[PDB]
Amino acid sequence: EALLGVYTNVVEFVKFLETALAAACVNTEFKDLRRMIDGKIQFKISMPT
């Protein structure tokens, strides 16, 4: 006698671009980030008097 069961699905959630939290961050997809060692940003702030 072949028996069947009832399974309920995993409740999915809104992806990251469709949440409004991404108004606070700037999203880029860097494909190979496991090869990166470091990353830097260099500001140069000139000042008037």
**In the complex, which residues of this chain contact other proteins (CB under 8 A)?**
47-49
Distance CA 39, CA 32 (A): 13
CB of 44 to other proteins, least distance (A): 16
Distance CA 12, CA 32 (A): 27
Report the residue number, 14 or 47, with the smaller CB distance to other proteins: 47
Specify the residue for token string 């999203």: 27
Report the residue number, 34 or 44, with the smaller CB distance to other proteins: 44
Report the residue number, 7 or 43, with the smaller CB distance to other proteins: 43
